[PDB]
RNA sequence: GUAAGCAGAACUGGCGAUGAGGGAUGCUCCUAACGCUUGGUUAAGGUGCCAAAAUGCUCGCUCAUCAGAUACCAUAAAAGGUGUUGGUUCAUAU
RNA sequence: ACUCGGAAUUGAUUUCGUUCAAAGAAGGUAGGUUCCUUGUGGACCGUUAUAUCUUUGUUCUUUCCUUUUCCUUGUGGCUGAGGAGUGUUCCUGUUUCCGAGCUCGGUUUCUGUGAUGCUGGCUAUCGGUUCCAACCGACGUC
């Protein structure tokens, strides 16, 4: 009954590994990572990928122990973000910082992923989401954020072109349509 | 699963969105008459789309133009191509299509019926406003079409016409809905009830 | 004088289960008259259906039918897939088609 | 320019799962898309509903901004917008076309009785008022 | 793109003005010109003080801005037309 | 359920053993971020 | 070898000996290999019309007085642009 | 092939939601000032007051989603059942309830392996040989 088609399909998932123990080098660091992923699997795939840059690890020479499934606190209402990124263009690679508004961090990444790639043609393999934390209004130093915020902000709908329902179309009609609303 | 005959209305529509429409339609068995084809619009500017007709009228076949492709400059005729564009037309099934639509750039004879409008194919809705568009009447005066201003003539006289029928109408539309006020107190107080749950 | 009272949908053949490039005449492909997605279509299933047409001729009538019934729905639109008695002739094609309601639910 | 996307305006839901159903309006997201809920009775489950599916009423509850589901119901019930836009036309023929669907045959037979008795009277009165 | 934008212009004394619609006829004591903007996605309207000119749009590219000072810039030599009217002076050379 | 309202003090617990230990990264990278700027300059 | 739908090799797979569905059209690309058939489901690939299936839903970018549009593939480069949309980093709102 | 439905479980042992309590804040309400373009206005000051929200506890809620195994009623498609007989004695199923320690034995009616059941039109249709139409396809050798 919730609509599938306005979202894309990602869940923030926290994982750890530890490497694994040897004859030489018993109890090794253990480390942590938050990731976003379309699955509890595909997480994990992002996981070693992103340690064989950091260290000296693989999924052969690595053990998983825990991946926790992370959402928001409270989704109900609208939050600032500023995501941070980088990504890889035909010439080379760049970070950015972008600031998108939902009422989910998953609202945000799936927001971004589509925003980047209209803009920037960056391809779903290149780019990687390096932190998305919470922003206040007054923080957040786009500007097309800073017109949004303040109370009593009014929008009127102009030019109302309706989706109809399936079996509401009809390819005929007497009246032609009418736009403006009121 | 249809009516008899659908006359169209072609002002603010666009060319090919119409045409595409109209084309399956008849291939379903529906006949089509089309209407006031010269207010019909394209996308692009004006200057855009006479030098894409341009480009049309330089490809002629160079042994013996006579035979050739035929550059036909009348609104109801270029919108006869399009809608024939999209049709299966040298098999016998897509020619009993074209029999089917009737192309008029308003004649006599469906002044007196009913004009509909495809609201999918419809210049309000589709182009983004600032995009500019261009009218087929124009376009079609600029390449030597010469009945423009009979269009205009004939159109404005018709238009008189029809407002004298309208304040006919209207005033008896006044005169039933008069008399319904008073047929619906004297039939019973049960009777009235049920009809404002139904909307009568 | 005319038909009194019609207890039938009306339908149109649009023309046969295909590709591109390739006929499956076996199946039959329906529109009906209301009828907009696969939704409304749930109806129309099981529902037996008539070709009718006429003939220079031959049992004591110049009309002939041929039966069928509706199978199931085909895509997100209203239309609806058949199967009659007979494959159904390339004559009838943009023609139309009496869909009777029963068998009833 | 009348009508305005701000908090606690109503709406009518044309399309998506919904179809039909009346909400409110509590925050705006971004230039696209609206907090939009019901706290009751419509129910519809509070979401980021899209600006193209919804269409916008007249009638307005004034309150502040981002907002709790129990905090509608406390000022809905002060108000009653719901049942305001429901006297209006518009509002009326909306339970019109859901009254019209549920029907019986023999509901469908009553009205048709009753509309051609009104004629009957309707053309005494076309040739008498005539006169 | 940003969502609201207005600037707004002072009407003199001795001008009336009358927007119906997009279409401004500005009428004083010399003579009166009318003008169309129908092409501008634009909110027209005078106050109630009404010796002023509001004009406003929502949803402006910054393209499309741009036609809110052009407006402004039309109708305000329109209202120094129907006062003072235009002179332009050429000289001869040869 | 009544082994439910039992450990539901300790979930919550796990939940700010998660986000704070990433905002405090999230600080700490910053920091790094700025003292590269001054020290270079 | 300047290069060639050029000449000569290595490993595997094809074409040749091989149709079917897709790439509009193509011996070699993709899916997939074939006894006659009824029903169901997919593959590659697609859903405005020709044409079976979305003028489906949702979020960006683009206005071309030669727009662009799907691997093999039916060509485009150095160098420019205060056309527009974002980013990185300095300096006083620009 | 598509559906109306439920019943327990996993996570963060509640994502949320909801009742209170304190604390804090701005995208600052009541309240003051004040200002015009008089507005469903804006600046300054105010922290719940004649609107609120968020953080942190607490009141009672099992659904959103996501693991796990399993019982369901509603419509439709394709294929098949046929020369007689007797009838359940054995066999599996469902069921009457009697005893022994959820499991086994004895007993009664019912249904399967042993099910085709009812009904209509025509005695010319059905079918076949020919030619023709229509939609889709379809350009010996080295």
């Not at chain 1, 998305?132 to 017109?147: G, N, P, Y």
């Not at chain 2, 500017?45 to 400059?73: A, E, I, V, W």
């Not at chain 6, 359920?1 to 919550?12: D, G, I, T």
Request: hydrophobic share 35%; aromatic share 8%.
């Amino acid at each position: 009954k919730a609509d599938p088609t306005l979202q894309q399909k990602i869940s923030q998932y926290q994982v750890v590994g530890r490497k694994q123990p040897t004859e030489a080098e018993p109890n090794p660091s253990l480390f942590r990572m938050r990731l976003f992923a379309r699955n509890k699997v595909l997480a994990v795939s992002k996981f070693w990928y992103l340690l064989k840059k950091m260290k000296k690890v693989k999924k052969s020479t690595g053990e998983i122990l825990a991946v926790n499934e992370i959402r928001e606190k409270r989704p109900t209402f609208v939050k600032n973000f500023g995501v941070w990124l980088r990504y890889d263009s035909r010439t080379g690679t760049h970070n950015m910082y972008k600031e998108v508004r939902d009422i989910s961090q998953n609202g945000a990444v799936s927001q971004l992923y589509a925003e980047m790639a209209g803009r920037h043609r960056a391809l779903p393999s290149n780019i990687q989401i390096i932190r998305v934390a919470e922003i206040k209004a007054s923080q957040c130093r786009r500007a097309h954020m800073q017109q949004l915020f303040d109370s009593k902000l009014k929008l009127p709908a102009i030019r109302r072109i309706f989706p109809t329902p399936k079996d509401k179309k009809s390819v005929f009609c007497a009246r032609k349509p009418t736009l403006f609303l009121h | 699963t249809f009516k008899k005959v659908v006359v169209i209305d072609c002002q603010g529509h666009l060319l090919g969105r119409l045409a595409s429409v109209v084309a399956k339609e008849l291939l379903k068995g529906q006949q089509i008459i089309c209407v006031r084809c010269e207010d019909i619009n394209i996308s692009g500017s004006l200057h855009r789309n006479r030098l894409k007709y341009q480009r049309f009228l330089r490809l002629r076949m160079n042994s013996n133009p006579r035979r050739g492709p035929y550059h036909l400059r009348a609104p109801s005729r270029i919108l006869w191509r399009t809608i024939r564009g999209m049709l299966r037309h040298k098999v016998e099934r897509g020619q009993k299509a074209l029999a089917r639509l009737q192309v008029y750039e308003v004649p006599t004879m469906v002044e007196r019926k009913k004009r509909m409008v495809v609201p999918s194919a419809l210049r309000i809705v589709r182009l983004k406003p600032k995009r500019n568009f261009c009218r087929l009447g124009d376009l079609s005066s600029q390449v030597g079409w010469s009945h423009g201003d009979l269009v205009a003539r004939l159109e404005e006289k018709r238009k008189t016409r029809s407002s004298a029928y309208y304040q006919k109408k209207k005033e008896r539309t006044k005169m039933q809905t008069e008399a319904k006020q008073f047929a619906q107190t004297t039939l019973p107080k049960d009777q009235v009830a049920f009809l404002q749950q139904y909307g009568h | 004088t005319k038909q009194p009272v019609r207890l039938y949908v009306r339908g149109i053949v649009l023309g046969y289960k295909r590709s591109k490039v390739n006929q499956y005449p076996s199946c039959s492909l329906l529109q009906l008259e209301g009828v907009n997605d696969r939704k409304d279509t749930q109806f129309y299933l099981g529902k037996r259906v008539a070709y009718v047409y006429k003939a220079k001729t031959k049992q004591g009538s110049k009309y002939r039918v041929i039966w069928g019934r509706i199978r199931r729905p085909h895509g997100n639109g209203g239309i609806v897939r058949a199967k009659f008695r007979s494959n159904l002739p390339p004559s009838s094609i943009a023609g139309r088609v009496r869909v009777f309601l029963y068998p009833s639910n | 320019f009348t009508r305005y996307y701000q908090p606690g305006r109503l709406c009518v839901v044309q399309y998506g799962p919904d179809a039909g159903k009346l909400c409110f309006v509590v925050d705006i997201i971004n230039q696209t898309r609206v907090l939009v809920d019901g706290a009751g009775v419509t129910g519809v489950k509070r979401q980021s509903m899209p600006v193209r599916r919804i269409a916008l009423t007249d009638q307005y509850l004034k309150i502040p901004r981002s907002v709790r589901s129990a905090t509608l119901k406390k000022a809905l019930e002060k108000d009653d917008v719901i049942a305001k836009f429901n006297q209006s036309s518009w509002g009326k023929r909306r339970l019109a076309k859901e009254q019209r669907a549920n029907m019986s045959d023999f509901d469908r037979f009553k009205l048709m009785v009753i509309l051609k008795q009104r004629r009957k009277v309707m053309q005494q009165k076309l040739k008498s008022l005539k006169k | 793109k940003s969502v609201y934008a207005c600037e707004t212009i002072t009407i003199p004394a001795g001008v009336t003005v009358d927007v119906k619609s997009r279409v401004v006829t500005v009428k004083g004591k010399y003579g009166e010109i009318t003008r169309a903007f129908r092409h501008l996605p634009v909110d027209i309207q005078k106050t109630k003080s009404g010796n002023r000119l509001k004009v406003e749009m929502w949803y402006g590219t910054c393209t499309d801005l741009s036609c809110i000072r052009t407006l402004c810039s039309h109708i305000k030599n329109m209202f120094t037309g129907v006062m003072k009217k235009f002179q332009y002076k050429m000289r001869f050379v040869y | 359920r009544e082994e439910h309202k039992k450990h539901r003090q300790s979930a919550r617990r796990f939940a700010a053993e998660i986000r704070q230990a990433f905002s405090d990264k999230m600080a700490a990278e910053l920091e790094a971020a700025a003292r590269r700027k001054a020290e270079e300059a």
